[PDB]
Amino acid sequence: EVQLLESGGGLVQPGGSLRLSCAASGFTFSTYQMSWVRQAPGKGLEWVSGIVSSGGSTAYADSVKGRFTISRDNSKNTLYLQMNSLRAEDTAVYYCAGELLPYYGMDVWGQGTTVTVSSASTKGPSVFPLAPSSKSTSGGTAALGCLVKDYFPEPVTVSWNSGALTSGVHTFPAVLQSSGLYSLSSVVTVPSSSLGTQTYICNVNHKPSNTKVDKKVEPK
Amino acid sequence: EVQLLESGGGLVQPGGSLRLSCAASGFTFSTYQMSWVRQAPGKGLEWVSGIVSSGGSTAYADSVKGRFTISRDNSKNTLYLQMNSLRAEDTAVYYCAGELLPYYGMDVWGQGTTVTVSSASTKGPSVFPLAPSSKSTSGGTAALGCLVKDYFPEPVTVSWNSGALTSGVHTFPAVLQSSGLYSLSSVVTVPSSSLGTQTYICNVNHKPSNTKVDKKVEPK
Amino acid sequence: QSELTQPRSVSGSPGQSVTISCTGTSRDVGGYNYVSWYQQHPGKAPKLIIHDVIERSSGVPDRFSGSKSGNTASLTISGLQAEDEADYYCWSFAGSYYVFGTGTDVTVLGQPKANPTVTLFPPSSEELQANKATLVCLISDFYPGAVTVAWKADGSPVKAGVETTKPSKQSNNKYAASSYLSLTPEQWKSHRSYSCQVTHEGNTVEKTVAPT
Amino acid sequence: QSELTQPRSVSGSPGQSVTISCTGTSRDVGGYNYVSWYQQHPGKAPKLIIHDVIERSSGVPDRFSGSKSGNTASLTISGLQAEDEADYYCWSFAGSYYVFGTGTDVTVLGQPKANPTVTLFPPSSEELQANKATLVCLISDFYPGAVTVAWKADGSPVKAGVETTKPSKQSNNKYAASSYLSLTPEQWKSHRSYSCQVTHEGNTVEKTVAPT
């Protein structure tokens, strides 16, 4: 209902720029103070800029002043953050957050957009099928999966049979290699008896490199 | 970890038969006592049949005695339920559930398999795109979705952009029509500003009819 | 075999306690100390919360407790939280079978008024070419779970071809329903506008579509 | 200018209370009654739980409370439950800006020690045709969050080309990790078997793969 929907994150070279957006709905956007809050990997929340319901009047964390500009228009109900002269320490999830009465606090939150500032470049994954054994499947249960190799940045999305498969799916946290590329694996555990009749496809999604792979996992 | 993975449900005519299965893992299947429990739509839990850790020795609810047979094999860690001469009142979700020490209770549960006993045949859905209006796109936010028309039985699965899209997604519960067919709608609310660069595909899955439809949703 | 009788429903306010009784026979709840309680949310498998009358399962807070007195078992839930809203079933061994109780639907009250968000779609191109036309009125995030739907064509009501679901509860015990108007492609084209007019607690919200 | 110091981490046992301090200056926590607390689980947005020093948000149970003495605000959590495991941030207005506290990681203990499930995959045919080979050792459902991985080739250990992640809490505050052994297609071909050997609390579990 009361929602904030953000866009605009990305991989960026140091010195680059990026504009985040946040489209509101289900509430009176015009009457709320709006913030951007970021969170570096493994770090805490950091408030970054605020703009009053009325527009124009704006506050900035010192971390970002002369570089970021918060704006709005209350007719499109949309909040912006122009980020110029990005540095590596600007790498964070950014959140849209609003607060009707000032001083109250904020409890509408966008879902977050990832900004990566690196001297980069994006690498899309190689996807490899992790085939069920003909040794384990003497018993009731079969483990099958997908190996998602050598991508940057974070994150990759993995789902199965286009989202239809849900039960018994564990996608593990990525490993950061020496190379500075990530790899992860998704595994589904399934009744071995299903292996002749049932199709298992892993749908691997990495936005930064515009990569969408579907890979059929078959017994070998 | 400790899981029970069931298969085999379905749409069946009255007088029909079906075999359910339940492949275990994460625990010593052969030392646990195993049950089937079912639940009819809107209704309560009901215990159905039990088999003791060894096999051979079995109990049945009187509702199903002479018609169902619970069995097992502890070598393949699998639990079965043969259901013969099915009638409409047997229409339910079926769960396998296990219990290591007897009279303790059941604390391993499968995810359930739907059994439909009907004289009506499976009907696959028609999927129609519900296009973002070119009106409230003056404002920040747009509603898009998919109309999933005239299927039986229950259920249909809907995901978006093969499961990568999860935020802003509301799939509504189905309407049962006069005809006895179901229809439902799935809706995604998205930033208007995304409606040019971003592709929104709804992935409709209806098992009973082996139907998987991808429908691209575009401006109209 | 026989039944294990629970109240159909009980409601509480946040922070209060409710007790759910379970009455069997000397052959079950009085025929052993093998009484369990199960909690079950919509669409999920039951979770075992109490076993052996009085013992919490791992991870179950002490806000949940079980007891027994003759042929009646009880589950008490204290400090009732939104998340406790669910169906609860007792269970007993009964010698040569097992039995679930009849189930109690526990509602947790408080929770603010929410007015519905209404989204109305007109028939799509693919549907019209198919010689059908469906207007879809989706109603969400309302509390309490009751709404009235009226449809309109130009001014004037329409009543033929309407199908509306009962309100059901979305993730968050906030409610969603749906309403459908089936039209022929040539009645869709005969008016300049169709409306879905949704009432909830005296207050009507309206949406409007048109052939355009 | 302005910090807002919290303890890095505090732990409690189930059913207990923990308190979390938040020390600012006369210019923030002491400089208004506009102290909020946030709760945030991994990978989700922070949830506002206390606002105006002492007021709970909708649907926040009574077992969360906030207070203040001079320049220190406090959050108390009583009857600690598994779901309270999370990070907590205070927040205050600060005149010409807003500031989050430094954050406290709250751990809720007990929870049963669990032995990992290990799943070992050998290199796929598609990979080996690409002239690479990766053995994947997936370790899940373990408690506490420390494991030791040893790799083997036939008899013997292999310490070259191993990348192992740090354990992370899966949904259920049970931990998962992975280990990756990168080989060439010919070193994979030149042994009878490879092993992934996982130790957790002195218990070693082994899985073994081989060519065909």
Q: How far apart are CA C39 and CA C55, in angstroms?
A: 14
The strand pair at C203-209 and C194-200 is best described as: antiparallel
Type of residue found at D98: Y
Nearest-5° Cα angle at B86, B82 to B87: 155
Q: How far apart are CA C80 and CA C173, in angstroms?
A: 15
B vs C, Cβ pairs < 8 A, gives 109
Please give the CATH topology (third level) of the domain spanning A120-219.
Answer: Immunoglobulin-like (2.60.40)
Q: How far apart are CA A41 and CA C190, in angstroms?
A: 58
Quick one: which H or E segment has residue D185?
helix D185-189
The sign one gets for the Cα dihedral A187, A189, A190, A196 is positive
Q: How far apart are CA B125 and CA B180, in angstroms?
A: 13
Q: How far apart are CA A160 and CA A204, in angstroms?
A: 9
Beta carbons within 8 Å of B65's beta carbon, 6+ residues apart: none
| The pair of three-digit structure tokens given for residue A13, joined into one six-digit string | 């070279």
Specify whether the CB–CB gap between B10 and D126 falls below 8 A. Answer: no
Q: How far apart are CA A159 and CA A188, in angstroms?
A: 10
Radius of gyration of chain A (CA): 22
Q: How far apart are CA A49 and CA A37, in angstroms?
A: 8
Using an 8 Å CB-CB cutoff, list chain C residues near B109.
45-47
| The pair of three-digit structure tokens given for residue D190, joined into one six-digit string | 């030149």
Cβ-based burial of B15 (10 A; exposed 0-12, middle 13-18, buried ≥19)? exposed
Q: How was this structure determined?
A: X-ray
Nearest-5° Cα angle at B35, B32 to B37: 145
Using an 8 Å CB-CB cutoff, list chain A residues near D38.
45
C176: distance to nearest CA of chain D, Å?
20
B218 DSSP 8-state letter: -
Q: Do domains B1-119 and B120-219 have the same CATH topology?
A: yes
Q: How far apart are CA A171 and CA A185, in angstroms?
A: 6
The sign one gets for the Cα dihedral C43, C103, B38, D82 is positive
Type of residue found at D154: D
The strand pair at A113-117 and A10-12 is best described as: parallel
| The pair of three-digit structure tokens given for residue D33, joined into one six-digit string | 């009654």
Strands (DSSP E) found in chain A? 3-7, 10-12, 18-25, 33-39, 45-51, 58-60, 68-73, 78-83, 92-99, 108-109, 113-117, 126-130, 141-151, 157-160, 169-171, 175-176, 182-191, 200-206, 211-217
Neighbouring subunits of C (3+ Cβ pairs under 8 A):
A, B, D
Describe chain A by its helix, strand, coil percentages, rounded to 5.
Answer: 10, 50, 40
Residue B149's CB is within 10 A of a number of other CB atoms, namely: 22
Give the residue on A whose Cα is nearest the Cα of D33: A103
Question: What are the structural domain ranges in chain B?
Answer: 1-119, 120-219
- Helix H, strand E, coil C: the string for chain C is CCCCECCCEEEECCCCCEEEEEECCCCCCCCCCCEEEEEECCCCCCEEEEECCCEECCCCCCCEEEEEECCEEEEEECCCCHHHCEEEEEEEECCCCEEECCCEEEEECCCCCECCEEEEECCCHHHHCCCCEEEEEEEEEEECCCCEEEEEECCCEECCCEEECCCEECCCCCEEEEEEEEECHHHHCCCCCEEEEEEECCEEEEEEECCC
Beta carbons within 8 Å of B52's beta carbon, 6+ residues apart: B33, B58, B102
B76 and A111 in contact by Cβ < 8 A?
Answer: no
D212 DSSP 8-state letter: -
Q: How far apart are CA D114 and CA D142, in angstroms?
A: 5
Specify whether the CB–CB gap between C31 and C23 falls below 8 A. Answer: no
Cβ-based burial of D107 (10 A; exposed 0-12, middle 13-18, buried ≥19)? middle
B135 DSSP 8-state letter: S
Using an 8 Å CB-CB cutoff, list chain D residues near C63.
79
The gap from C-alpha A46 to its chain's centroid, in whole angstroms, comes to 18
Q: What residues pair up with A114 in beta bridges, in sequence order?
A: A93
B208: distance to nearest CA of chain C, Å?
19
The strand pair at D9-12 and D104-108 is best described as: parallel
CATH of domain A1-119: 2.60.40.10
Quick one: which H or E segment has residue D186?
helix D185-189
Radius of gyration of chain B (CA): 22
Q: How far apart are CA B170 and CA B185, in angstroms?
A: 9
* Cα atoms in the Cβ-side hemisphere of radius 13 Å centred on B157: 21
| The pair of three-digit structure tokens given for residue D72, joined into one six-digit string | 């220190």
Using an 8 Å CB-CB cutoff, list chain C residues near A26.
117, 141
| The pair of three-digit structure tokens given for residue A65, joined into one six-digit string | 């002043």
Nearest-5° Cα angle at B94, B88 to B97: 150
| The pair of three-digit structure tokens given for residue B87, joined into one six-digit string | 């009638």
* Cα atoms in the Cβ-side hemisphere of radius 13 Å centred on C65: 9
Nearest-5° Cα angle at C121, C119 to C124: 160
Using an 8 Å CB-CB cutoff, list chain B residues near D174.
1
The gap from C-alpha A202 to its chain's centroid, in whole angstroms, comes to 19
Chain B residues 137-176 with CB within 8 Å of chain C: 143, 145, 147, 149, 170, 172-175
D136 and A112 in contact by Cβ < 8 A?
Answer: no
D143 DSSP 8-state letter: B
| The pair of three-digit structure tokens given for residue B52, joined into one six-digit string | 């003791």
Domains of chain D (ranges, CATH numbers): 1-110 (2.60.40.10), 111-211 (2.60.40.10)
The gap from C-alpha B188 to its chain's centroid, in whole angstroms, comes to 22
The sign one gets for the Cα dihedral A63, A65, A66, A68 is positive
Q: Is A194 an 8 Å CB contact of chain B? A: yes
Q: What residues pair up with B36 in beta bridges, in sequence order?
A: B49, B96
| The pair of three-digit structure tokens given for residue B193, joined into one six-digit string | 């500003």
| The pair of three-digit structure tokens given for residue A140, joined into one six-digit string | 């009731």
Give the residue on D whose Cα is nearest the Cα of C80: D61
Q: How far apart are CA D158 and CA D147, in angstroms?
A: 17
